[PDB]
Symmetry: C5
Subunit: 306 residues, 5 copies
């Protein structure tokens, strides 16, 4: 059972694709294992770079194929490099950039709690064990954060053994590969979305109610039609700029709320009026519920928070 020591260097985690639950990662992988000591020119460990590595494979030198279990597609390999030591051991170092997949829940969108994961695992070796895994999240925990879309926490390893129940034509016990699973926790930078989406959306819902502080009945009604046209014009601005998903976020709901608030008003207003014993018998208290559902909406809003 060959002992391999992996070292992942995260360089940048960017491009989150909300719909496909994808995110790009740029960094280097370093794998080290020991082989039958070798005679290296001069003596100081040998250095085989790009084109060359493929040659040394053709001459016997084995190099384990470490697949990235959760990569959509196939990584963009930069510089590959083999460092061969006289005492045997071999060190594989290569830079990569690939799109990884992972279950991502964007339900509370404006305020996300996501976790970026990597998953290394020998592509075709049952007993070729991954020794110790180390990740260098050489990123700035509290240096830059509000210049970047996401805020992090700290690296997180975890080696384990995966069992496939239908591998190759084997019975002895060939179905357990060791998988390195790295985890980086991150939280979304709310700022932008609050000050450009949540806030103004609130002032619209607020100023929505001020349709009651209108005297006439025609004014009280016809104005909610320009108010209706406003929430649509907003849901539009919201959708065209926000990340598409298969479910509704918090903002997606405030938009529905605004739609109900205005439809509610439409009913009351077209009720207070025609709930008359003469015609203009606008129920003085109902037509004046100017503080009834404006706060009765903090009751409908604190139920969406339950």
């Amino acid at each position: 059972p060959v002992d391999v020591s992996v070292s992942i260097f995260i360089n940048k985690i960017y491009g989150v694709n909300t719909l496909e639950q994808t995110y790009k990662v740029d960094g280097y992988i370093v794998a080290q294992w020991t082989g039958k000591p070798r005679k290296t020119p001069g003596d100081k460990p040998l250095i085989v770079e790009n084109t060359q590595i493929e040659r040394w494979i053709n001459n016997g030198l084995w190099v384990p194929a470490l697949e990235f279990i959760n990569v959509v597609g196939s990584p963009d390999t930069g510089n590959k490099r083999l460092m061969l030591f006289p005492d045997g051991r071999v060190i594989y170092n290569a830079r990569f950039l690939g799109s990884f997949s992972n279950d991502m829940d964007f339900r509370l969108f404006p305020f996300d709690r996501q976790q970026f994961v990597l998953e290394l695992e020998p592509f075709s070796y049952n007993n070729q064990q991954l020794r110790f895994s180390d990740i260098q999240v050489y990123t700035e925990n509290i240096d830059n954060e509000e210049i970047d879309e996401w805020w992090i926490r700290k690296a997180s390893t975890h080696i384990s053994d995966i069992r496939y129940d239908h591998l190759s034509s084997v019975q002895p016990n060939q179905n357990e590969f060791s998988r390195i699973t790295v985890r980086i926790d991150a939280v979304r930078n709310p700022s932008y979305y609050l000050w450009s989406f949540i806030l103004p959306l609130g002032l619209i819902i607020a100023a929505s109610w001020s349709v009651f502080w209108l005297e006439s009945f025609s004014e009280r009604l016809q104005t909610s039609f320009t108010l209706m046209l406003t929430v649509v014009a907003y849901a539009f601005y919201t959708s065209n700029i926000l990340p598409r998903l298969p479910y509704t976020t918090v903002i997606d709901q405030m938009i529905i709320a605004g739609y109900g608030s205005i439809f509610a008003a439409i009913l009351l207003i077209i009720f207070a009026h025609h709930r008359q014993a003469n015609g203009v018998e606008d129920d003085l208290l109902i037509q004046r519920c100017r503080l009834a559902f404006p706060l009765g909406f903090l009751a409908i809003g604190c139920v969406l928070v339950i």
Copy 2:
């Protein structure tokens, strides 16, 4: 007639392209067949990974080219791997990611019933038969359904024989290739579309009718012009966010319905008024059909459901 045993591992089905009737699939293919027993180093199965496989071909080792009949373009191959057994048999294992095509009907859009299909078939071998086909939809059913856009059911195999009537200059009986056809059934996650499209679109059509509970004639009419401007502003929000198709979905129709509901109102309102024995002889019952077509629209709507 060589016997091949295929095993398809579906890893992720994503990126549905409504217009091109395309969808991406990531997974591995495993093909097994038996050859003339071989002398393998040591004696345990041999493993040829990437660069190497191409070399063994140049030394006679035959490896059947299994084409993906319905793939738009040419798959993104990840790690290839040949496992050669001493007793002969060879096992081909490779990871792939490709865009597949298939007839897809998105007529009832908000509520889709689609089926993702794969079609393997030897690219150039008449009598090289596909033995048994197995598919591991190791996706998690009633697990993350509401975090993902599509909900599934269960795998579905089916080997068969395809006959081409104009092959290479051959007449004997060389025109029948065995094709593996895999099928995965899925249903779309309605949620988002209902609560952000169907609903508000309904409240707009509803509040649309409340143009009758207006006293004056000018109000009854000029208000449907801001109502007209609203349905357009909505069809806009809908189109910019929905998947483009060559035909109309359900929602595309609710939008047409709202256009007619408002044009209908325009006619009645500009009829009730000028259908006078004086000037302002608004047919008191017609001007008050405030419950005539609002429910007479549940008759026009239950005919689109006929």
Copy 3:
């Protein structure tokens, strides 16, 4: 003069790029010619697949480079395959997916009459003649037409000789290559565009005129300003969803028509009023041309159909 027999199999024609006059085609090419009889292992045709073909070229085996004259870029080659017969003849079979160019006129957009073309031609062989050309448009002439964006007709061949008035430093007669030209006729699926664009655009132009059935002068005018704002909001919805072109389509014109219809109204209304012998002397007939240009627009529309 070598005799080659080509056979093109159209698998899918998709992705029409209106601006670049481009469209993607997936399928296989099959070329057959006869060479000096050969000794094939066993005796049955010798099947050489991918990696291998390039090798047989290095050992003399000639394989004519058949260029796709009208391909933007360079095709995506799938599986190549050489079938060598003992009696000499060689059969080349490969799958391709490429973007082809062709003059495309989208003037009558909603209702297009386009034709997808392919053009094969030896890249470097004057006297290497293309014998007979066959195309298998193995599609459903009338099976699923309303699920797909385009409707077709039937294949269409045509071999010919192209003369380049300036090729190599040759002139005896080396300037005539045989070019296979395939043609597939198709018509656009109007549906969607009619029911989501033409129709509602008409009801907007219609309801546009109902600005005359308004009593007051301020109403008659100020309402066309919300009507003006409507046509713009529509031209917007139209452009964002329609295919960009360098010229105007039919729909691009109905939008111009609506802009004139509303500007026309603006003039009449601000004329009828200030065209008085007292003040509100709205020429009792002009202010009531409620049926003057509404049908006088079917005269302006039947002149755009001239």
Copy 4:
């Protein structure tokens, strides 16, 4: 000093990228030079195609690397081809598709005057001279210019010598390479933009002024608020469909003009009214400058043309 004769065949110039000042070009390059006479199988020139050319290089055959000085990225090479004559001379022919750069000024956007340029030049040869350059703009000048986005003129060559002041540690005179510079002049197809942007934008600015032919003060003002909302809704439609640039085009200004015209009106109207010696003494002449700045805008417009 080797004499090379180049021949560029322009096949299609498309995809202009306004922001990066990029445009795609598809065509073939043909380079001819003479070498030490050779023994060609048979005797008629020898034809070397794709894979093979790289082989002949490995056997001494030199082939000059001709770089495309102004190409963003690295061309998409189609079919390469070497034609070797017995009398020595060699003819290189290959098809290419690349994205070229060049200074492009889109200030007068609707009416552009651009020029597409190519620049060939030996990548590493000081005295390897480019003899005569010929370009076949076998595109069709007066063909269907109203189908294509750009209209052309005629080819344009120009060989020259470029001097680099920072080369290898060479002193004698190694710093002058011959560069072929091809130029194709083109003008944009105004049509679409005039009839879908310039025109309606004008009718909006026109009908903008008709805010003065309103009686009341509130009408005169409140209407310019729906007029304001209209210019914004238009600047939106314009931006979303027009090519993004770092500067303003003609249309970008008409939009600014419409913004000033409406802000001007806002001032006058809120001046005429409150510029009194009573309360409603709207300066009968100012409130009636209905022809003051409407033509005084053809003065503001003929100064933007000044």
Copy 5:
């Protein structure tokens, strides 16, 4: 410790990707170092172009792999070239085009102060020192600037030594690589954004206040609802055209300011009216604060500039 002399030729810096903090750079790299004198066919330096270089490596010729530390992905290499001198020294020259990363702050968007950086560094050589670094920003310092999106300054070198605290299994002193760091300073071209965004946005905020110069109460209020609908329609036009970021720019704030200015007005107006001692006791001074916050907004604006 090998002495290498690098020379970077910037050809074009384009395509800034605000969200990923990416930008594309096209140019050439030239590296020179001296080796054991060689016998060059003839005597003048020897030139190995593309395909060939990889060959000379297979025959011992070492060529140091110089990685681009901050490149997202892997550069697009154009023409490679090795110039071997008889006196030993070797000159590597290759053209590249790649996407580079760097911390970019776009807080003051309309007016950016960015700096494009390159970072070369031997991929696997501890003592292979970078001698002197030179950069040719052969661009037009003033020549053209309002034709291009960015304005520059002057090149900027800086060689240094980077220490990795845990590289290979090497304890001696192998952890210091010499890194060339190039810096180019640039400022964004404000023009377009000022005249198409800042300005009209101001005129909207200005004309926003003129809602006070309205007589009635219903007018004063209902007009701010068409004013509200305007700011939204503007925030939309702004977002769809501006570069997406995780934080708010200057413009993102003017939009918030307009939202508050309008919500402020809504409060005052629905205060002046109902803050009575009868009914219409519109605090003649408050209802006439027509110059209160219009300039009291230059106080709220000069606090955002605090």
